[PDB]
Curated annotation (Swiss-Prot), chains A, B, C, D:
Transmembrane segments: none annotated. One of its GO terms (cellular component) is extracellular region. This is Streptavidin. The keyword Mitochondrion does not apply. One of its GO terms (molecular function) is biotin binding. It is found in: Secreted. Belongs to the avidin/streptavidin family. Residues 4-123 form the Avidin-like domain. A motif (Cell attachment site) lies at residues 48-50. It comes from Streptomyces avidinii.
Length: 123, 123, 123, 123
């Protein structure tokens, strides 16, 4: 339903760039570029979305992962964004995210950051 | 480094089954079967992991997504697990997860569940 | 430093009302009224804030708890807001929150909702 | 119902010490000592719990806050624990927590850590 809705270039409140293709099978594939956190250039992302969402005005559930390793840098970390795509005049992806850093057992308690990103089709 | 470490069948504290292959390129591919939450049978998952982790005793950062749609059911939801793989005698994947349900704007505030799953190679 | 900054009436993006007094000792005391989630009227809250924040332009760390029981209703739940107070022209409290419902062991996995509320001094 | 159940000394998986009194009015008051994160000695905590929980075998919802300032140190941060008290043979408090550090706007995205602590009456 939202394959075309989701496919494209999205920007969050930080100036990060999320380039995604939604597959007819529920796949999400693309690249993430973070404006913050010592990331450089594009990182692979993959994820999933609900390819057959409720017809009742509900958002479309989705998430995706970026491991912060590319040819430029390795943060030894990974972020997952869990959220929903909201169609219409000003389409949004509203997300919450978990970033886990690889740590020792002794630092495991502080391994994970949590936040929220809102993505729009205009910067 | 942990491609073989991660590839395989993992079980969490709920009796859920996570079947994953780690690609040399950082890919995670496989299937998830939840013991809870009105899921039935296998659901596609995709994700990423740090294919070149720190050599310093740190875990390996990873995450993955499941959209809760297969041929049996559609929960109109998606879970992301963010965590780290810890190698050795009793290998673990320690995760935190966000489950977002597709909702109306009026219910968006209650769209997202958070928990923690610990995966082991024995049930 | 921010005792006066924090003391007052705040509104979030949902139209909820947070009435708080910051004590010189780091205490937060007051009442919360939720615009959503079948809450009615005021609920007691308590919390803490950093009464001696960094002088470097950083926010002031704080959190507080509401148990969703008053003389009108009992949701058998509790929310904690963790965030920071940002002073200046448009003062904000930026929070992330965890709502845990009392559950059986069998439903514990779905006990906890997560979100984010941003509070302003104007509605 | 669980006033006596909750009142006491609890330990988490990190060796931290949570000393709490549950008030008949839903209050939680006491002190927290963290085994990790450069905390030293006791810090004030306050919170709330459901003083009239469901009679149906459900846990009792609660949370509390610690601002990481005492006479010894100031981390410029605050943790909230949201969870539920589970009575019986081996009483537990199962929590999820958010730690927000005071930050600049530019670092706000990385302000918040998330984890999970399980508290028992024996160390």
């Amino acid at each position: 339903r939202d394959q075309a809705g989701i496919t494209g270039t999205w920007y969050n409140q930080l100036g990060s760039t999320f380039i995604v293709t939604a597959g007819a099978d529920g796949a999400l594939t693309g690249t993430y570029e973070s404006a913050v956190g010592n990331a450089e250039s594009r990182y692979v992302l993959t994820g999933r979305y609900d390819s057959a969402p409720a017809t009742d005005g509900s958002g479309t559930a989705l998430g995706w992962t970026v491991a912060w390793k590319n040819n430029y840098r390795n943060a030894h970390s990974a972020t997952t964004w869990s959220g929903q795509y909201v169609g219409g005049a000003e389409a949004r992806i509203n997300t919450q995210w978990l970033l886990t850093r690889g740590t020792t057992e002794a630092n495991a308690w502080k391994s994970t950051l949590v936040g929220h990103d809102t993505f729009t089709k205009v910067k």
